[PDB]
Design an enzyme around this catalytic site. Structure first.
Site, mmCIF file in Angstrom:
data_model
loop_
_atom_site.group_PDB
_atom_site.id
_atom_site.type_symbol
_atom_site.label_atom_id
_atom_site.label_comp_id
_atom_site.label_asym_id
_atom_site.label_seq_id
_atom_site.Cartn_x
_atom_site.Cartn_y
_atom_site.Cartn_z
ATOM 1 N N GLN A 1 0.866 -1.216 0.000
ATOM 2 C CA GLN A 1 0.000 0.000 0.000
ATOM 3 C C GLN A 1 0.891 1.251 0.000
ATOM 4 O O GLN A 1 2.093 1.120 0.291
ATOM 5 C CB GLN A 1 -0.942 0.012 1.209
ATOM 6 C CG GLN A 1 -2.309 0.617 0.907
ATOM 7 C CD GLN A 1 -2.702 1.717 1.863
ATOM 8 O OE1 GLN A 1 -2.918 1.483 3.052
ATOM 9 N NE2 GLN A 1 -2.814 2.930 1.343
ATOM 10 N N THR B 1 -4.513 5.860 -3.614
ATOM 11 C CA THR B 1 -3.459 4.811 -3.614
ATOM 12 C C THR B 1 -3.534 4.009 -4.916
ATOM 13 O O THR B 1 -4.643 3.572 -5.270
ATOM 14 C CB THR B 1 -3.603 3.874 -2.406
ATOM 15 O OG1 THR B 1 -3.533 4.676 -1.225
ATOM 16 C CG2 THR B 1 -2.553 2.781 -2.380
ATOM 17 N N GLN B 2 -2.395 3.839 -5.597
ATOM 18 C CA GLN B 2 -2.229 2.898 -6.736
ATOM 19 C C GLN B 2 -0.876 2.190 -6.591
ATOM 20 O O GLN B 2 -0.286 2.247 -5.487
ATOM 21 C CB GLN B 2 -2.326 3.611 -8.092
ATOM 22 C CG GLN B 2 -2.741 5.073 -8.023
ATOM 23 C CD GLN B 2 -1.573 5.980 -7.721
ATOM 24 O OE1 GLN B 2 -0.852 5.787 -6.743
ATOM 25 N NE2 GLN B 2 -1.392 6.987 -8.565
ATOM 26 N N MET C 1 -4.013 11.107 -0.426
ATOM 27 C CA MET C 1 -3.710 9.648 -0.498
ATOM 28 C C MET C 1 -3.893 9.145 -1.934
ATOM 29 O O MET C 1 -4.408 8.021 -2.102
ATOM 30 C CB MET C 1 -4.613 8.845 0.445
ATOM 31 C CG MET C 1 -4.349 9.131 1.904
ATOM 32 S SD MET C 1 -2.684 8.626 2.395
ATOM 33 C CE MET C 1 -2.896 6.847 2.462
#
Ligand code: MG
Ligand code: MG
Lengths: 204, 210, 222, 233, 226, 125, 196, 195, 196, 195
Positions: free
Chosen positions: C1, D1-2, D107
Site C-alpha cells: 500500500q 493509492t495505486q 492519499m
C-alpha cells in the site's frame, strides 16, 4: 512482550589509568510495576566483573552458569580466569544458544593480573564481542548512556575521578528511563583493591 | 500518569505528577497535567496530552461565552456536560481523554465530574487515574472532616505512593486547592526531594535505603 | 500500500537563556541509509523574532513552517501590524497541528524567541499540538543522547556540593550565550559520533532583543 | 493509492561552475519486461529549465501536460512572457512540489521522483528534488532510485561541497555524468544503454543531447571467469 | 558495513570500514571486520556480526586441523566449500555474507559468499550496506593487471565511498594484502579520515559531586591462610 | 554385525595387575628410544628415525608432531597408535578448549585430555 | 536468467547469459551459469543460485564416484541424478536445470528439469525468466542436425532477444560446445550480439 | 457486567439495577443509578457501552418529556416502549449503532395494569412478567420461572427480587456493588431505600 | 488473449485471437476482440471484457459526437480519449488497449495503452497474455513499409506462435485491414495457421 | 484474578491467598487452598493457569519431601526457593511452559530468621519484606510501602494484611471470595481460622 525490556535496568563499564569501573541500577520491574530495589546486576568471579542487563531470569541463570564454569576452570587451570579469556567464554556460551538465546546484554570489566592492563567488553544476546577502549553500555537506557559517556568520558582518568564520571553517566541516563533507577552501585576496580559504592538517587 | 481529585470540607484537592513517557523514554519531567480552564474550573490531563489541552482550553472559551450570554458563573455540571457531549460526537475516531472537571459553586458546592473519551460523565467524591486505570490510591486516611493543610498533604503523599511504584509516574507533584472564590496553586514539589523527606519524617519506605 | 509518511532523520535543540534563546539543528537530510543532502536548512527565521523547526517527515515539516510563516503575515494584516508574541505563536501552532489530528503532521516542533518580559522562551510540540514552555528541549533521532547530558550540564541534576555528601545541590547559575553554544556544539559532536543520521553540518539561530543571527559549524561527514 | 505500472529508473544531475547537467535513460520498464525504449524522461520547459522524471510513466505524461499547460497559461496577458516574466526553474519546481504534496495528502500520489535542473534570471544554478511524498531537498549532486546509491558517490567525488562548484568545468561535469550512466548500465537491471543528457549553461543556454549510448565498456575480463568456485574450465 | 576485495598482479587485497551499528546507534567506532581463516586466507563479513565471526572461526579451526592432517598449507577453495556447505545447511538462518580472499600453493583467489550458501568468482567484489557506493568506484577505476600499490589505492577508495555516502559505514579503513610467496600483511587502521575534533569543554567533575549512601571493600582474593 | 564387544578386554587379574596395560608397556619397551630435556628458556624432544627400508623416504614419517603452536609430542612404541592419538590430540585442543576460550590449551590440560583418551581405551568395551 | 541447450549434427551446445540479480541490483554481471558435472556432461542453472550450486556439486560428486566404479556415465544417468535430488527435495528447492552431454554412442542429448523435478528429453530446451520472450523465435528457427556455426548463430540470436526483453538477463553470452573433438568455451560481448 | 432486572407483580413493576461502574479492571463508581424517569408512571433502566447508555436514556427522556408538554398527556407504557424500540431499530443500521439494552417499567393509568417491556440494542421488544439483560438473565430466570405468581404483592416481588440478588452475589465472578430498587405503581415512581 | 496492430505501406492491420476464458474454461471460442470506434479507427481489447467493452462504447460515443461537430477525428484524438478514460479510472480498470487507425494525411498509425493508462505511438504493438512468447519473433521479423500480403503473413505467423504457447489464446485469427481502399475483415482457421 | 500476598514480619512470614476458583464467568469453588507445605518450616502459595498450578506445586512438594527423607534434613528456604526458581527457568524454554507464579514463605531454623521469596513463571526470583502476584500487587504494594516496619509483630502483620484485603475487596472488580491466611514461624505452619 519484548523480553529485553520487561524487567528493565542498565550496566555501564569504563576504563581509567591503571583501573576499570563497572556500575548498574538496582531496579527489577514487571513493565510499569517496580518489584525490587535490591536487584544488583554486577557479579564477580575472582577479579573478573560481569554486569548483565535484560530478562532477570536469564541474568540470574547466566550468573549461576558462569560461577559454575569459572569454578571448574580454576580447579583445572589452578589459577583464576582472566578478563580476556572470560570474554571468549561469555561469547562461546551465548552463541551455543544461537537459535534460542538468553535475552541479555552482558558487560565484562577487570584488570589482567599479569599485564596489569585495564579491560572492558560488551556483547549482543548471541555473543558478538564489542571490545571498546573507552566505555561499554547495556540495558533499556543504552541510548541515554551512549549520550552521557560520549560527552562525559575522557581517557586516563584517576580512580576517584573515573568514579564521578561513571556515576554521573549512570544516574542522568537512568533518570531519562522509566524502567531504570531505584538506586545504583559503582565498582572502582584496581589491580589488588576493589571499592563498592551505593549512590543516592531519586526513587521514582 | 497519576492524577488525583477528591472532595472535602474545605473544597477540592487536585494532585498530579509531571512525567511524560514515549515507550521507555522519559520525554519530560515538567508536564502540567492540571489545565486551568478558568479561575474557578480545573481539568486533569490523562490519555492524549493534545486532546486534553485542546478541548479543555476550548471548554474555557465555551464557559466564557456562557457567562457573557447568561450573566452567571457556569455550573460544574454544565461545564462538564459541554466537554462530555463534544467528545461523544468524536466517539470511535480515536480521541484519548480521561479527565476530572473540578469546580466549587454556591449552587452545587464542591463538584468533581470524571469525563471520558468513551462518553462517560460521572460525578463523584474522589477520582484517581494511575497509568491507564481510573477509580474512586491508599483510601485509608481519607475523611470528610479534614483540614486544608492535611488534605493537601494527603494528595501530595498519594502521588508520591504512585510515583515510586509506577515507572510512568514521577518528576514532581503539582497541588491545587479549589474554593468557591476560585482555585489556589499549592506549588511544584520534586518527587526526588519529597521521597527522602517523607521517608525520614513519616518513617515510611523502610524497604528503600537512604 | 502507499505510505504517506517518511523519516528524513535530523536532530534539533532549543535552549532558553535569561535574555536569549538558541534553536540548533544538523543540516543532514537522509532517507534509510542514503544522504539526500549535507546542507538542507531545518531551522527558519519566521519573523517577529521567532525561530521554528519541525523535525521528522521533512514534507510535513516544510508544510507546517510555510503555514506558520503565512499565519504571521496574516496576523499583521488582520491586527494592524501587531508583533506576534512567542506565547501567541505557540497557541497558533497548536491549532495548526490539532487541525490535522486525524492525519497528523509527522513532526516534533520547537519554536524559540523572547517572551513579552524580554526573557528567553522555548516551546515544544507533539505531532498533534500538545505544547509546553521549556528551558531545554532536544527533538529528533539523537534526542535520547542529548537530553540526559543537558539535564546534567544545564540544570546540574545529580550534581551536589563537594564535602556536603549530597546534602547541598550544586546551585543553578545563569548560562551565557557563549556557554550555551559550547553545550550545543558538544551535544551535536557527541550525537554525530554515536548516531548515523546526525552529521555533515550544525546551523544555530540565536535570538536576542537585537534580532536573529546565524552560526554554522561543520560536523563529521561519515 | 495505486501501484506504478510502466516505470523509468534513475535520473542523475549535478551543478558545475556555469550551470547544471541532468541525464536519464530512455527506458520504460513493465516490471522485469523492458517494454519501451524510445521514452524521453527529460522534459525541457522554455530555454532555462529541464525536468527529469523517474517512476510511473503515465504520471510523467500527466506532469508533461501540466508543464506544457503552465507555459501556455504564463503567456496569457503577459507581454514579457519571453523576457522578465518568463517561467523560472524555481517557479516550475515550487508548482510541481505543491502538486506532489497535495496529491500525497489526498492519499492519491503522482508515483514519481522529479529533479528540476535549470539556471535562474540572475544566472544562479537551480537543482532541487521532489518525490511522491512531497519531500524536497537541494544538493550539488542529486539522483533518484539506483542513481542515489551509485551515481551520487561518483558525482560527489567531483563536487563534494558548494565550494567545489566554481572549480568544476562543463567538460569534467559531463564526463562524471556519462561515467555514472555507464556504472548504472553495468549494475541497474532496469537501465538501458540509450540515454538523453541536457546541459543548462548561463552563457550557452540549453543544450539537449538525444540518442546518447554508453560506450568504452569493460567486458573482456569475463572470458577468464569460470564456474562459481572449484571449476577450472 | 562496506567490504571490498581486489585481485592484483601477484595477489589479492581485502578492505573494510570499522563501524558496527545496533540499528541507528554506533556501538563500536573502531570494529575489526577483517578476519583470519588461516595465516594467508582472510575474509571480511557483513550481516549478523556474531554469525560472520562464528562461521570464520569454525571453518578456520577445521581448516587448521585439515592443514595438520594433510601436511599442506590450506587452500581458499577449501575455506569456500566448507563455508558454503555449512551456510546452505542452515538455509540463510546464519546471516553471514563474506568476501573470502587468500594465496595458497594453487595461486591467488577472490570469492564472495552469501548467507544461503551461493558463491561467486571475481577480480573485484563489494558487500554490505555500502556495497553500491563501493562498486561504483570499482566499476569506474578497476582495470586488468593492477599493481599492489594501485589495488590498495582502489580498495581503500571503494571503502571511503562507503564511509562517506553510506550511513551504515564509517570511521576508518582496514586493509589486508595477500601476495604470492609472501607473508599476508594486515594493515589495521590503514586510513583514519574521521578523528573527532577537540570538545569545547572538559566535563571532568569536582570530587564529591556524586551523593554516596555506602562504601565497602569487595573481597576479590581467595579464602586466606591462618 | 554391530560391535558386540560391549565388555572390558582389560580386567584385574587375581594379583591386582591389569594385564593389557602391562603388555602395552612391554610394547613401548621394544619401541625405539625417545627423550625430553627441559631447559630454563626451552624444552627439547628427540628420537631416532629408524627407517624400515632405505627405499623409504623417512622425512614423510613424522615421529615428532606439532599438537598446537606451543606444544610438540614424540613417542616410543606402536607408530600407528601414535599417529591417531596426534589426530585426536590436535582436534580436542580445538573442540574442548580453543572453540570455548579463544586460546590454545596449556600443556598440562592438553596432556590431561590425551591421558583421558588413553584411560578410556583401558576401560571402554 | 536466459539459458538454452541445442543438439546439432556433431553434438550439443549450452548457452547462458552472465547476469545475477538481487531485486533490481546486478550482484554479478559476469556469472558463469554453464557448470561441469563431468568431462562432457554440463548443465545450465536457473532458480536459487545456492540451490543449483548445491545440486550441481552433489551431482559432480555422484558422477565422480560412478566413474571410479562403472566408468563414464551416460547423459541420461546424469539427468536421472539431477531429477532424484530435485524431485525428492521439491518442497525446499527452487531450481530449473537443463542437462546437456555428448556420448559417442548416443551423441548430443538435452534433458530439461523444471521446478516439479520432472524430466523431459528434447532436441533443444530453453529456460530462465528470459526464455518466455523467445518461445516464438526458437520454435520458428530451430532445425535438427544443424552445423556448429548454424547452432552458435541460433543460440546467439535467441539469447540476444531474451537479454533485450528481460531485465533479469544481460552481460555476456557464454557457450560450451560438446563434441567428439572435445570441450570448447565461447564468449560473445554486448557490442557483438546487441546489433544482431 | 451490569445487572438490570425487572419483575411485574399484581399492581406494580419493580426494577433492580447494579450500582457498579467498571472500566477494564478499575471500579469508577459504586453508587451509579442506571435509570431515567421518562414520565411520572414510566421508568427505563439501561445497561451497555460507556457513553451510549446515558446519551440514549437522556435522549428518550427529552423526547417523552417534549410529547408530555405538547399534548398535556402521558403516553401509555406500550406507546413509550414502541417509540424506544423504533429508535433502537434505526440505530443498528446507522453508521455507529447505540450499544444499549433497556427495561421499561410503567403503570398504565387507563388500563390500571402494570407493564414490563424488554428491548435489546437491535430493537428486539417483548412484554414479560419478569426480564433481565446480560449474564444475570441466565442465573435469575430459572429462579423466577419457579417462584413467580401473577397475583404476587409488591412485598412478595421484593422478597423474590431479594432472593435473586443474593443468588447473583454468590454465583457471579464480578462484584456489582449491590442494586438500586425502584417501584412503579398508580401513585408513581419511588426508590426502595432498604435492600 | 493475443492482439497486435502493424503499420505497413498502405495503412495498418489489427490482429487478434478469438478465445475468452473463465479460469481454464473457454467461455467464448469465437470472440471478436477487434472493435470499431470509428469508420477507420479500430481497437484491440485485452483485460476485463466488461471494462474494455464499457471503454470502447464510451469512446465510440465520444468520436460520434466529435464527428457531428468537428468532422472525422484523427487516430491520435481517438487514442487521447481512450487514455483519458484509462488514466483517470486506473484504480477501477483492468484494460490493455491497442488503438489503430487510417488517416489520408497521417496514413497508418498504432497507439498502445498499457494498464497505467500511458500512451505509446509505435510502428507496431503486441499485447495480451500471449504477446510475451512473440516479443523475440516480432522484433526479428517486423520491417517498416511492408506490403499488405507481407503484413498479413507477419501477423498470422506471430499470433500462430502466441496461440501455440498461450492456453489463454486460441480459436480463429481475426484481422481488420485499414487503408484508403476501405475496411477489409480477414479470418484464418486453425487448420491454416497451426501448420505454419 | 487470584490474590497471593506475603508479608515477612520480625519473627514469621504470613501468606494470604484468595479462596475463589473461577473458569470464565462461573465460580467453580469458594474454599480453594492455593498452598502446599514443602517442608515443616516452608510454605509455597501459587496462582496461574488451571492444572499447571497444582501439578507444579505437588511436583515441588514431592521433590522437597524426597530430599527430606534421603538426608534426614530440612533444606533452608533459600535452598528450596533456588530449586523452585531453576524448575521454572527450565519450563519457559520447554515445549509447553508452566504458567505458575509462587510465593515461598519459610522460617530458617539455623539463622532463626523468617524469609519470603517471590518467583514468577519465568524463574524471576527476589527476597522481599512483602510481595504479591497479579493485579493485587498494584493495589496492595503502595499500602505496605507506607505501613510496613521490619520489627512488626505477627499480630501487627495480620492487621496490615487485614487492611490490604479490605482495600482489595473495595477496589477489585472481581469477587475473590476472601483469603486463607497461614503463618510460618519457628514452631512450624498454622492456619489463622479468624479473618
Ligand atoms: Mg528512572
Ligand atoms: Mg492454445
Amino acid at each position: 512482550s519484548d523480553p529485553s525490556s520487561i524487567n528493565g535496568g542498565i550496566v555501564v563499564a569504563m576504563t581509567g589509568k591503571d583501573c576499570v569501573a563497572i556500575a548498574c541500577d538496582l531496579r527489577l520491574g514487571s513493565q510499569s510495576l517496580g518489584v525490587s530495589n535490591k536487584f544488583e546486576k554486577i557479579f564477580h568471579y575472582g577479579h573478573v566483573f560481569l554486569g548483565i542487563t535484560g530478562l532477570a531470569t536469564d541474568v540470574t541463570t547466566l550468573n549461576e552458569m558462569f560461577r559454575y564454569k569459572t569454578n571448574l576452570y580454576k580447579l583445572k587451570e589452578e589459577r583464576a580466569i582472566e578478563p580476556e579469556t572470560f570474554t571468549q567464554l561469555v561469547s562461546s556460551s551465548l552463541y551455543e544458544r544461537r537459535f534460542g538465546p538468553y535475552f541479555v546484554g552482558p558487560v565484562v570489566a577487570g584488570i589482567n593480573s599479569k599485564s596489569g592492563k585495564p579491560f572492558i567488553a560488551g556483547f549482543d544476546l548471541i555473543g558478538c564481542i564489542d571490545e571498546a577502549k573507552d566505555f561499554i553500555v547495556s540495558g533499556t537506557a543504552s541510548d541515554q548512556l551512549f549520550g552521557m559517556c560520549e560527552s562525559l568520558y575522557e581517557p586516563n582518568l584517576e580512580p576517584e575521578d573515573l568514579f564521578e564520571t561513571i556515576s554521573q553517566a549512570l544516574l542522568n541516563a537512568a533518570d531519562r528511563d522509566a524502567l531504570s533507577g531505584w538506586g545504583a552501585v559503582v565498582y572502582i576496580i584496581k589491580k589488588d583493591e576493589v571499592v563498592k559504592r551505593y549512590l543516592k538517587m531519586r526513587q521514582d | 500518569t497519576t492524577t488525583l481529585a477528591f472532595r472535602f470540607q474545605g473544597g477540592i484537592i487536585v494532585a498530579v505528577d509531571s512525567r511524560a513517557t514515549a515507550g521507555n523514554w522519559v520525554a519530560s519531567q515538567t508536564v502540567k497535567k492540571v489545565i486551568e480552564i478558568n479561575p474557578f474550573l480545573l481539568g486533569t490531563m490523562a490519555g492524549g496530552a493534545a486532546d486534553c489541552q485542546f478541548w479543555e482550553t476550548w471548554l474555557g472559551s465555551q464557559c466564557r461565552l456562557h457567562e457573557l450570554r447568561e450573566k452567571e458563573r457556569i455550573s460544574v455540571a454544565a461545564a462538564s456536560k459541554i466537554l462530555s457531549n463534544l467528545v461523544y460526537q468524536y466517539k470511535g475516531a480515536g480521541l484519548s481523554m480521561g479527565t476530572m472537571i473540578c469546580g466549587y459553586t454556591r449552587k452545587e458546592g464542591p463538584t468533581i465530574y470524571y469525563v471520558d473519551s468513551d462518553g462517560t460523565r460521572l460525578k463523584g467524591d474522589i477520582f484517581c487515574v494511575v497509568s491507564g486505570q481510573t477509580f474512586a490510591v491508599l483510601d485509608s486516611n481519607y475523611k470528610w472532616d479534614l483540614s486544608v493543610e492535611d488534605a493537601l498533604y494527603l494528595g501530595k503523599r498519594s502521588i508520591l505512593a504512585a510515583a515510586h511504584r509506577d515507572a510512568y509516574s514521577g518528576g514532581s507533584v503539582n497541588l491545587y486547592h479549589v474554593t468557591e472564590d476560585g482555585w489556589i496553586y499549592h506549588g511544584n514539589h520534586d518527587v526526588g526531594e519529597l521521597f527522602w523527606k517523607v521517608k525520614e519524617e513519616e518513617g515510611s519506605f523502610n524497604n528503600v535505603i537512604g | 500500500q502507499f505510505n504517506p509518511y517518511g523519516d528524513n532523520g535530523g536532530t534539533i535543540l532549543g535552549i532558553a537563556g535569561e535574555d536569549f534563546a538558541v534553536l540548533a539543528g544538523d543540516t543532514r537530510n537522509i532517507t534509510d541509509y542514503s544522504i539526500n543532502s549535507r546542507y538542507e536548512p531545518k531551522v527558519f527565521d519566521c519573523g517577529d523574532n521567532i525561530v521554528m523547526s519541525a523535525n521528522g517527515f521533512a514534507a510535513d515539516g516544510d508544510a507546517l513552517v510555510k503555514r506558520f510563516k503565512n499565519s504571521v503575515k496574516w496576523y499583521h494584516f488582520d491586527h494592524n501590524d501587531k508583533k506576534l508574541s512567542i506565547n501567541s505563536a505557540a497557541r497558533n501552532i497548536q491549532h495548526l497541528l490539532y487541525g490535522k489530528r486525524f492525519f497528523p503532521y509527522y513532526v516534533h516542533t520547537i519554536i524559540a524567541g523572547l517572551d513579552e518580559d524580554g526573557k528567553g522562551a522555548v516551546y515544544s510540540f507533539d505531532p498533534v499540538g500538545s505544547y509546553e514552555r521549556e528551558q531545554c528541549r532536544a527533538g529528533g533521532a539523537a534526542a535520547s543522547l542529548i537530553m540526559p547530558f543537558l539535564d546534567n550540564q544545564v540544570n546540574f541534576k545529580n550534581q551536589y556540593e563537594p564535602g556536603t555528601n549530597g546534602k547541598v545541590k550544586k546551585p543553578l547559575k545563569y548560562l551565557s550565550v557563549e556557554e550555551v553554544i559550547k553545550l550545543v556544539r558538544d551535544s551535536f559532536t557527541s550525537a554525530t559520533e554515536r548516531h548515523i543520521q546526525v552529521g555533515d553540518g550544525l546551523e544555530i539561530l540565536i535570538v536576542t532583543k537585537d534580532g536573529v543571527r546565524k552560526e554554522f559549524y561543520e560536523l563529521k561527514r561519515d | 493509492t495505486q501501484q506504478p505500472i510502466v516505470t523509468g529508473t534513475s535520473v542523475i544531475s549535478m551543478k558545475y561552475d556555469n550551470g547544471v547537467i541532468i541525464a536519464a535513460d530512455n527506458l520504460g520498464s513493465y516490471g522485469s519486461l523492458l517494454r519501451f525504449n524510445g521514452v524521453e524522461r527529460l522534459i525541457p520547459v522554455g530555454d532555462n529549465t529541464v525536468v527529469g522524471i523517474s517512476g510511473d510513466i503515465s504520471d510523467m505524461q500527466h506532469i508533461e501536460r501540466l508543464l506544457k499547460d503552465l507555459v501556455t497559461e504564463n503567456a496569457y496577458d503577459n507581454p514579457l512572457a519571453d523576457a522578465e516574466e518568463a517561467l523560472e526553474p524555481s517557479y516550475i519546481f515550487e508548482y510541481l512540489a505543491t502538486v506532489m504534496y497535495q496529491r500525497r495528502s489526498k492519499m492519491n500520489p503522482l508515483w514519481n521522483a522529479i529533479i528540476v535542473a535549470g539556471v535562474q534570471s540572475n544566472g544562479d544554478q537551480f537543482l532541487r528534488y521532489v518525490n511522491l511524498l512531497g519531500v524536497t531537498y537541494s544538493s550539488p549532486t542529486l539522483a533518484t532510485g539506483f542513481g542515489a546509491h551509485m551515481a551520487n558517490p561518483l558525482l560527489r567525488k567531483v563536487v563534494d561541497r558548494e565550494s567545489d562548484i566554481p572549480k568544476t568545468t562543463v567538460q569534467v561535469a559531463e564526463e562524471a555524468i556519462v561515467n555514472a550512466m555507464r556504472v548504472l548500465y553495468y549494475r541497474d537491471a532496469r537501465s538501458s544503454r540509450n540515454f538523453s543528457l541536457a546541459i543548462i549553461d548561463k552563457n550557452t543556454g540549453l543544450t539537449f543531447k538525444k540518442n546518447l549510448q554508453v560506450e568504452n565498456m569493460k567486458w573482456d575480463f569475463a572470458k577468464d571467469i569460470k564456474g562459481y568456485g572449484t571449476q577450472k574450465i | 558495513t562496506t567490504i571490498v576485495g581486489v585481485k592484483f598482479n601477484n595477489g589479492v587485497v581485502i578492505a573494510a570500514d570499522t563501524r558496527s551499528t545496533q540499528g541507528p546507534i554506533v556501538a563500536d567506532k573502531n570494529c575489526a571486520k577483517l578476519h583470519r581463516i588461516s595465516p594467508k586466507i582472510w575474509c571480511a563479513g557483513a550481516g549478523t556480526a556474531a554469525d560472520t565471526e562464528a562461521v570464520t572461526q569454525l571453518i578456520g579451526s577445521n581448516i587448521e586441523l585439515h592443514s595438520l592432517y594433510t601436511s599442506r598449507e590450506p587452500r581458499v577453495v577449501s575455506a569456500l566449500q566448507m563455508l558454503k556447505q555449512h551456510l546452505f545447511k542452515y538455509q540463510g538462518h546464519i546471516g553471514a555474507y563474506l568476501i573470502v580472499a587468500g594465496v595458497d600453493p594453487t595461486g591467488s583467489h577472490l570469492f564472495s559468499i552469501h548467507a544461503h550458501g551461493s558463491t561467486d568468482v571475481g577480480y573485484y567484489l563489494s558487500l554490505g550496506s555500502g556495497s553500491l557506493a563501493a562498486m561504483a568506484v570499482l566499476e569506474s577505476h578497476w582495470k586488468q593487471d593492477l599493481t599492489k600499490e594501485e589495488a590498495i589505492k582502489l580498495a581503500s577508495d571503494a571503502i571511503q565511498a562507503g564511509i562517506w555516502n553510506d550511513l551504515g559505514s564509517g570511521s576508518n579503513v582496514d586493509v589486508c594484502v595477500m601476495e604470492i610467496g609472501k607473508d599476508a600483511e594486515y594493515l589495521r587502521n590503514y586510513l583514519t579520515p574521521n578523528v573527532r575534533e577537540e570538545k569545547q569543554k572538559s566535563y571532568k567533575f569536582p570530587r564529591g559531586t556524586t551523593a554516596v549512601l555506602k562504601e565497602s571493600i569487595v573481597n576479590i582474593c581467595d579464602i586466606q591462610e591462618e | 554385525m554391530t560391535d558386540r564387544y560391549s565388555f572390558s578386554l582389560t580386567t584385574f587379574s587375581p594379583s591386582g595387575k591389569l594385564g593389557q596395560i602391562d603388555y602395552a608397556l612391554t610394547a613401548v619397551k621394544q619401541g625405539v628410544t625417545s627423550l625430553g630435556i627441559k631447559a630454563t628458556n626451552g624444552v627439547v624432544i628427540a628420537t631416532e628415525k629408524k627407517s624400515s627400508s632405505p627405499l623409504a623416504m623417512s622425512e614423510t614419517l613424522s615421529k615428532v608432531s606439532l599438537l598446537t603452536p606451543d606444544i610438540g609430542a614424540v613417542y616410543s612404541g606402536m607408530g600407528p597408535d601414535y599417529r591417531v592419538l596426534v589426530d585426536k590430540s590436535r582436534k580436542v585442543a580445538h573442540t574442548s578448549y580453543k572453540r570455548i576460550y579463544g586460546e590454545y590449551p596449556p600443556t598440562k590440560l592438553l596432556v590431561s585430555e590425551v591421558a583421558k583418551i588413553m584411560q578410556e581405551a583401558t576401560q571402554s568395551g | 536468467t536466459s539459458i538454452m541447450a541445442v543438439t546439432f549434427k556433431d553434438g550439443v551446445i549450452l548457452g547462458a547469459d552472465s547476469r545475477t540479480t538481487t531485486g533490481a541490483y546486478i550482484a554479478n554481471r559476469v556469472t558463469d551459469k554453464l557448470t561441469r558435472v563431468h568431462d562432457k556432461i554440463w548443465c545450465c542453472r536457473s532458480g536459487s543460485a545456492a540451490d543449483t550450486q548445491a545440486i550441481a556439486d552433489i551431482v559432480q560428486y555422484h558422477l565422480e564416484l560412478y566413474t571410479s566404479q562403472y566408468g563414464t556415465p551416460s547423459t541420461e544417468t546424469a539427468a536421472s541424478v539431477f531429477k532424484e535430488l530435485c524431485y525428492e527435495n521439491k518442497d525446499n528447492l527452487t531450481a530449473g536445470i537443463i542437462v546437456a552431454g555428448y556420448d559417442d554412442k548416443n551423441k548430443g542429448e538435452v534433458y530439461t528439469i523444471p521446478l516439479g523435478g520432472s524430466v523431459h528429453k528434447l532436441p533443444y530446451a530453453i529456460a530462465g525468466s528470459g526464455s518466455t520472450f523467445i518461445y516464438g523465435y526458437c520454435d520458428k528457427n530451430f532445425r535438427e542436425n544443424m552445423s556448429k556455426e548454424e547452432t552458435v548463430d541460433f543460440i546467439k540470436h535467441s539469447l540476444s532477444q531474451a537479454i533485450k526483453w528481460d531485465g533479469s538477463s544481460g552481460g555476456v553470452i557464454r557457450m560450451v560446445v560438446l563434441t567428439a573433438a572435445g570441450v570448447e568455451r565461447l564468449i560473445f560481448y554486448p557490442d557483438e550480439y546487441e546489433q544482431l | 457486567m451490569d445487572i438490570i432486572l425487572g419483575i411485574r407483580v399484581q399492581d406494580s413493576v419493580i426494577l433492580a439495577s447494579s450500582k457498579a461502574v467498571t472500566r477494564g479492571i478499575s471500579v469508577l463508581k459504586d453508587s451509579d443509578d442506571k435509570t431515567r424517569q421518562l414520565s411520572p408512571h414510566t421508568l427505563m433502566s439501561f445497561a451497555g457501552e460507556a457513553g451510549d447508555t446515558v446519551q440514549f436514556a437522556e435522549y428518550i427522556q427529552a423526547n417523552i418529556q417534549l410529547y408530555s408538554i405538547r399534548e398535556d398527556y402521558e403516553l401509555s407504557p406500550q406507546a413509550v416502549s414502541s417509540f424506544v424500540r423504533q429508535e433502537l431499530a434505526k440505530s443498528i443500521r446507522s453508521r455507529r449503532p447505540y450499544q444499549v439494552n433497556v427495561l421499561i417499567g410503567g403503570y398504565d393509568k387507563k388500563k390500571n395494569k402494570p407493564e414490563l417491556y424488554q428491548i435489546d440494542y437491535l430493537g428486539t421488544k417483548v412484554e414479560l412478567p419478569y426480564g433481565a439483560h446480560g449474564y444475570s438473565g441466565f442465573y435469575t430466570f430459572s429462579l423466577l420461572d419457579h417462584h413467580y405468581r401473577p397475583d404476587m404483592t409488591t412485598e412478595e416481588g421484593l422478597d423474590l427480587l431479594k432472593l435473586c440478588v443474593q443468588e447473583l452475589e454468590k454465583r457471579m465472578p464480578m462484584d456489582f456493588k449491590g442494586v438500586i430498587v425502584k417501584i412503579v405503581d398508580k401513585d408513581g415512581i419511588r426508590q426502595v431505600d432498604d435492600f
